[PDB]
Design an enzyme around this catalytic site. Structure first.
Site, mmCIF file in Angstrom:
data_model
loop_
_atom_site.group_PDB
_atom_site.id
_atom_site.type_symbol
_atom_site.label_atom_id
_atom_site.label_comp_id
_atom_site.label_asym_id
_atom_site.label_seq_id
_atom_site.Cartn_x
_atom_site.Cartn_y
_atom_site.Cartn_z
ATOM 1 C CB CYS A 92 -0.927 -0.022 1.210
ATOM 2 S SG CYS A 92 -2.089 1.366 1.253
ATOM 3 C CG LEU A 93 4.356 3.505 -1.984
ATOM 4 C CD1 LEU A 93 4.640 4.187 -0.659
ATOM 5 C CD2 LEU A 93 5.616 2.803 -2.485
#
Ligand code: NA
Length: 158
Positions: A92-93
């Protein structure tokens, strides 16, 4: 195929010049014949001086024909004890999110370096994994103890 042309260019440029300790390759076809340009198998070394140092963390990158308009799905093949890694392994970025900071011009090297940096710099605004998110807050010393232990487990196998 715009996607495969770009991927071949990314691979060629990666082989010419990439950061030490990293790997980014086409993954083997499931039938055994040839390589799959649309699914890469990669490795990220823990950044020196940080909690993940010494470990080597394998990750896949899955592309579609909408690449480079659509970012790859980046997934650690063993889930890491980190607040921003989903239980699936997915990273998650914001640069990997089409509706946030992904740009077609982002390179494979920029993705892998961004993920390496994420390991050392968890983002409290994007929790993706309950237990490390909670431990990070409950007792950062204990979080550090668990991550250092996992880093040893991810040292390249002898
Ligand atoms: Na796992």
């Amino acid at each position: 195929s715009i996607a495969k042309k770009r991927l071949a260019q990314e691979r060629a440029e990666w082989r010419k010049d990439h950061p030490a300790g990293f790997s980014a390759k086409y993954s083997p076809m499931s039938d055994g014949k040839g390589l799959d340009i649309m699914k890469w198998i990669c490795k990220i070394p823990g950044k020196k001086g940080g909690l993940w140092e010494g470990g080597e963390y394998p990750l896949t990158m899955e592309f579609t024909e909408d690449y480079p308009s659509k970012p790859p799905k980046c997934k650690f093949t063993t889930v890491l004890f980190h607040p921003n890694i989903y239980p699936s392994g997915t990273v998650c970025l914001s640069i990997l999110n089409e509706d946030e900071d992904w740009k077609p011009s982002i390179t494979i090297k920029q993705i892998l370096l961004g993920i390496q940096d994420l390991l050392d710099n968890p983002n409290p605004n994007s929790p993706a994994q309950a237990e490390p998110f909670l431990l990070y807050q409950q007792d950062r010393d204990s979080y550090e103890k668990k991550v250092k232990k996992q880093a040893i487990e991810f040292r390249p196998k002898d």
